[PDB]
Structures are given as structure tokens and as C-alpha cells.
Design an enzyme around this catalytic site. Sequence first.
Site, PDB file in Angstrom:
ATOM      1  N   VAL A  45       8.123   6.944  -2.433  1.00 32.14           N
ATOM      2  CA  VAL A  45       8.496   5.872  -3.348  1.00 32.14           C
ATOM      3  C   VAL A  45       9.105   6.707  -4.614  1.00 32.14           C
ATOM      4  O   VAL A  45       8.445   7.658  -5.173  1.00 32.14           O
ATOM      5  CB  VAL A  45       7.611   4.906  -3.605  1.00 32.14           C
ATOM      6  CG1 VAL A  45       6.979   4.302  -2.171  1.00 32.14           C
ATOM      7  CG2 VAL A  45       6.347   5.050  -4.370  1.00 32.14           C
TER       8      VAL A  45
ATOM      9  N   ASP B 169     -11.396  21.582 -18.829  1.00 24.09           N
ATOM     10  CA  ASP B 169     -11.061  22.848 -18.809  1.00 24.09           C
ATOM     11  C   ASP B 169      -9.533  23.074 -18.230  1.00 24.09           C
ATOM     12  O   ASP B 169      -9.303  24.181 -17.985  1.00 24.09           O
ATOM     13  CB  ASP B 169     -12.000  23.785 -18.381  1.00 24.09           C
ATOM     14  CG  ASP B 169     -13.362  24.123 -19.158  1.00 24.09           C
ATOM     15  OD1 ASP B 169     -13.080  23.331 -20.448  1.00 24.09           O
ATOM     16  OD2 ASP B 169     -14.240  24.392 -18.744  1.00 24.09           O
TER      17      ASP B 169
ATOM     18  N   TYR C  85       0.619  -1.173  -0.049  1.00 21.86           N
ATOM     19  CA  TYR C  85       0.088  -0.028   0.159  1.00 21.86           C
ATOM     20  C   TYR C  85       0.916   1.040   0.093  1.00 21.86           C
ATOM     21  O   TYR C  85       1.496   1.627   0.908  1.00 21.86           O
ATOM     22  CB  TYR C  85      -1.021   0.003   1.278  1.00 21.86           C
ATOM     23  CG  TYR C  85      -2.125   0.837   1.194  1.00 21.86           C
ATOM     24  CD1 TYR C  85      -2.189   2.083   0.659  1.00 21.86           C
ATOM     25  CD2 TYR C  85      -3.307   0.662   1.811  1.00 21.86           C
ATOM     26  CE1 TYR C  85      -3.028   3.061   0.546  1.00 21.86           C
ATOM     27  CE2 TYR C  85      -4.482   1.312   1.800  1.00 21.86           C
ATOM     28  CZ  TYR C  85      -4.224   2.663   1.146  1.00 21.86           C
ATOM     29  OH  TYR C  85      -5.316   3.526   1.221  1.00 21.86           O
TER      30      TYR C  85
ATOM     31  N   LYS D  76      -5.717   4.885  -7.395  1.00 21.39           N
ATOM     32  CA  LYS D  76      -6.500   6.448  -7.392  1.00 21.39           C
ATOM     33  C   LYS D  76      -6.699   6.678  -8.892  1.00 21.39           C
ATOM     34  O   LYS D  76      -5.764   6.895  -9.640  1.00 21.39           O
ATOM     35  CB  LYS D  76      -5.655   7.203  -6.592  1.00 21.39           C
ATOM     36  CG  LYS D  76      -6.530   8.423  -6.354  1.00 21.39           C
ATOM     37  CD  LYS D  76      -5.708   9.275  -5.305  1.00 21.39           C
ATOM     38  CE  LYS D  76      -6.339  10.392  -4.570  1.00 21.39           C
ATOM     39  NZ  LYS D  76      -6.842   9.804  -3.533  1.00 21.39           N
TER      40      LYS D  76
ATOM     41  N   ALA E  40     -15.285  13.594  -8.430  1.00 24.44           N
ATOM     42  CA  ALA E  40     -15.233  12.522  -9.430  1.00 24.44           C
ATOM     43  C   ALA E  40     -14.295  11.526  -9.353  1.00 24.44           C
ATOM     44  O   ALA E  40     -13.914  10.910 -10.336  1.00 24.44           O
ATOM     45  CB  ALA E  40     -15.027  13.429 -10.877  1.00 24.44           C
ATOM     46  N   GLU E  41     -13.979  11.104  -8.292  1.00 27.54           N
ATOM     47  CA  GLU E  41     -12.764  10.216  -8.064  1.00 27.54           C
ATOM     48  C   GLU E  41     -13.496   8.705  -7.952  1.00 27.54           C
ATOM     49  O   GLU E  41     -14.417   8.447  -7.517  1.00 27.54           O
ATOM     50  CB  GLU E  41     -11.986  10.311  -6.681  1.00 27.54           C
ATOM     51  CG  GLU E  41     -10.932   9.388  -6.639  1.00 27.54           C
ATOM     52  CD  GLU E  41     -10.208   9.585  -5.034  1.00 27.54           C
ATOM     53  OE1 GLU E  41      -9.461  10.235  -4.978  1.00 27.54           O
ATOM     54  OE2 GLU E  41     -10.590   8.772  -4.157  1.00 27.54           O
TER      55      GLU E  41
ATOM     56  N   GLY F  87      -3.648   6.372   7.349  1.00 27.61           N
ATOM     57  CA  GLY F  87      -4.147   5.002   7.115  1.00 27.61           C
ATOM     58  C   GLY F  87      -4.907   4.342   8.424  1.00 27.61           C
ATOM     59  O   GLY F  87      -4.492   3.119   8.685  1.00 27.61           O
TER      60      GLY F  87
ATOM     61  N   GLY G  46       1.093   5.389  -0.413  1.00 26.27           N
ATOM     62  CA  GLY G  46       0.489   6.416  -0.049  1.00 26.27           C
ATOM     63  C   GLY G  46      -0.613   6.062   1.118  1.00 26.27           C
ATOM     64  O   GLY G  46      -1.735   6.457   0.860  1.00 26.27           O
TER      65      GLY G  46
HETATM   66  N1  LIG Z   1       5.952   9.281  -4.178  1.00 26.75           N
HETATM   67  C1  LIG Z   1       5.245   8.973  -3.100  1.00 26.75           C
HETATM   68  N2  LIG Z   1       5.509   7.809  -2.361  1.00 26.75           N
HETATM   69  C2  LIG Z   1       4.792   7.604  -1.347  1.00 26.75           C
HETATM   70  N3  LIG Z   1       3.796   8.327  -0.955  1.00 26.75           N
HETATM   71  C3  LIG Z   1       3.332   9.383  -1.441  1.00 26.75           C
HETATM   72  C4  LIG Z   1       4.040   9.675  -2.480  1.00 26.75           C
HETATM   73  N4  LIG Z   1       3.587  11.013  -3.023  1.00 26.75           N
HETATM   74  C5  LIG Z   1       2.452  11.136  -1.931  1.00 26.75           C
HETATM   75  N5  LIG Z   1       2.487  10.298  -1.093  1.00 26.75           N
HETATM   76  C6  LIG Z   1       1.479  10.227  -0.049  1.00 26.75           C
HETATM   77  O1  LIG Z   1       0.155  10.121  -0.295  1.00 26.75           O
HETATM   78  C7  LIG Z   1      -0.458  10.394   0.767  1.00 26.75           C
HETATM   79  C8  LIG Z   1      -2.113  10.916   0.158  1.00 26.75           C
HETATM   80  C9  LIG Z   1      -3.110  10.616   1.200  1.00 26.75           C
HETATM   81  N6  LIG Z   1      -4.464  11.420   0.729  1.00 26.75           N
HETATM   82  C10 LIG Z   1      -3.395   9.151   1.535  1.00 26.75           C
HETATM   83  C11 LIG Z   1      -4.166   8.913   2.757  1.00 26.75           C
HETATM   84  C12 LIG Z   1      -4.102   7.466   3.096  1.00 26.75           C
HETATM   85  N7  LIG Z   1      -4.266   6.314   1.966  1.00 26.75           N
HETATM   86  C13 LIG Z   1      -5.018   6.971   4.260  1.00 26.75           C
HETATM   87  O2  LIG Z   1      -5.643   6.027   4.249  1.00 26.75           O
HETATM   88  O3  LIG Z   1      -5.134   8.074   5.236  1.00 26.75           O
HETATM   89  C14 LIG Z   1       0.124  11.367   1.614  1.00 26.75           C
HETATM   90  O4  LIG Z   1       0.288  10.799   2.778  1.00 26.75           O
HETATM   91  C15 LIG Z   1       1.489  11.526   0.955  1.00 26.75           C
HETATM   92  O5  LIG Z   1       2.661  11.514   1.996  1.00 26.75           O
END
Ligand SMILES: Nc1ncnc2c1ncn2[C@@H]1O[C@H](C[C@@H](N)CC[C@H](N)C(=O)O)[C@@H](O)[C@H]1O
EC number: 2.1.1.57
Length: 283
Positions: free
Chosen positions: A107, A168, A57, A161, A192-193, A63, A59
Site C-alpha cells: 500500500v 541510542d 488489515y 504496531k 518492547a513492541e 496471517g 500487513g
Molecule cells: N507498504 C506495505 N503495504 C502492505 N504490506 C506491507 C507493507 N510493508 C510491509 N508489509 C508487509 O508487512 C508484513 C509484516 C509481517 N510481520 C506481518 C505478519 C502478519 N500480520 C501475520 O499475521 O502473520 C510483511 O508480510 C510485509 O510484506
Amino acid sequence: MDVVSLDKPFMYFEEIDNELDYEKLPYQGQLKLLLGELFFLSKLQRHGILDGATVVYIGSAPGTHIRYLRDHFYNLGVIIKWMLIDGRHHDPILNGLRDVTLVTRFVDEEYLRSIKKQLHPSKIILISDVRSEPSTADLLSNYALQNVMISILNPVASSLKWRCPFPDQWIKDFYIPHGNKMLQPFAPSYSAEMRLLSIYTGENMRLTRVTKSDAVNYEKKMYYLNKIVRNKVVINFDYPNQEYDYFHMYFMLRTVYCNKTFPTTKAKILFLQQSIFRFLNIP
Ligand SMILES: Nc1ncnc2c1ncn2[C@@H]1O[C@H](C[C@@H](N)CC[C@H](N)C(=O)O)[C@@H](O)[C@H]1O
């Protein structure tokens, strides 16, 4: 709200059958992720490819909801290792779990190769919720990274995601993997996700081009979903809450496996909904 009679909700983007010109709950974000990931992993459990896999997992921070996912499959006896990777620190409720590895790192391509080397040849299931409001360049960079995740990690299945850039704000056509576009209950009112759910056969990830006309179709279909469909009360639905999102959640939750037996399907879903809401501190 307007009343409606439905046999089933829209589960995937393709099922939305109308369009419209585009113009609340505590911690709803964790609930949205929890439902979609339970749906995705339970679908993999049905296919018999979840057992023995490592869920990577990316991002994943904070979490909080991931603790519920891990406990659910752990209590079912499904053998899973969790590897949670994010530059931000995770919720402390994920501490003290031996089958969950917490990695503090952003990453890139070089690091993705390293984790593939250490996990190979075990099955990898990929969940990406990375996000860097975001610009179209930010989204294009994110989706490019998610493509790199698949080409290097080569997962047996992935949940990505997926929100198309607004027409636009278009820059260029881009490419995303083949897969089913799962709609999310309890998403933000006009989000819209969606989540791109892919199961890889022959591990040949064929890429599909996304165009500006696709962006228009995404925007109009999702606005119709958010403005009209999600504001309906499903009057034939036998449940304490007949609002569409609960109707949508109900159909997602009936794919979930449970150790406990219940007299009815409704009782099982009611138990699951109470369990999920209580953990996430939702009334
Ligand atoms: N290149 C990357 N590698 C890892 N994590 C990343 C990267 N770019 C952004 N993120 C992370 O993506 C996350 C986006 C969040 N909205 C995710 C929430 C998370 N899935 C949760 O369950 O709460 C942030 O915590 C960022 O630090």
C-alpha cells in the site's frame, strides 16, 4: 521463577510502575497477534461499533491467525467484511472465505485513497502490522505510513504496531496518534513492541510528539516488564498455568464474547485458550 501475588496484570504501558537498566513456545508470533487483535475487536464489539464494519488489515500476510478471528466473529453472528492487504501471499488457510478479500499489494498513499473510495461510506476498522532487524529510518517510515493510513482511511478505530526506536539509535522526534498502548502477552522475551489502540471521536486524530526521553522511558519500563514481571509466577491465580503471560492472557480473554455458556468464567477462558492453542498447533 519468583512467586508473586497479583490482583491483575499490566494491561497498558502506563501501568508499569518500575524500571530497570536494559542489558520458546511454537508459533508464538501468531498467538501474540491473535490475542491482541481479539482483545481490540472484542473491545469494539462491546462498544457496538464492530457490527457492520469492514476490517482493513494491512500487513496481514501470512496471517494464519486471522482465520481464527474471522471464524470467531462469524460464529457469533457479527457482520464483518475482511480486507487483507499485503505484498506477500497469505496463508492458504484463508482461502475459500467469501467475507475475506485477499489483496496482493504493497500500500502507498495513492492506493489508500482508492480503497477508501470503494469502501466509503462504510465503517472502516484498521489493523496495521506492517514492517519493512529494522532501522530507525525503517520504523519512522512505517509509522509515517500508518499515520497516512489513518488520515486517508479515517477509520472508526485502529490498532497500530508501536515500538519506539531505541534511544541510542535516535534520529528525530516523530508523531504518532493518540491511543492506549496495549501490552502483548507471549511477545518475544525482550520485545518492547506494543499495540496502539485508538477509537476516533469526532474523527479528529490528534498527533503526539515522541522524544528521545520517551525512548529512554520505553526502553527501561519494557525491560523491567520483560526481565522481572513476565518471569513471575502468580501464585494466587486459579489456572493450570500461573506464569505471568497466562495471567496476562487470561485477563485479555475475559473480554471476548462467546455463543457457548460456561458454568464459570475460568471454564470459559480455559475453553478459549484450548481452542486458540489447538488451532495454532501449540501444546
Ligand atoms: N507498504 C506495505 N503495504 C502492505 N504490506 C506491507 C507493507 N510493508 C510491509 N508489509 C508487509 O508487512 C508484513 C509484516 C509481517 N510481520 C506481518 C505478519 C502478519 N500480520 C501475520 O499475521 O502473520 C510483511 O508480510 C510485509 O510484506
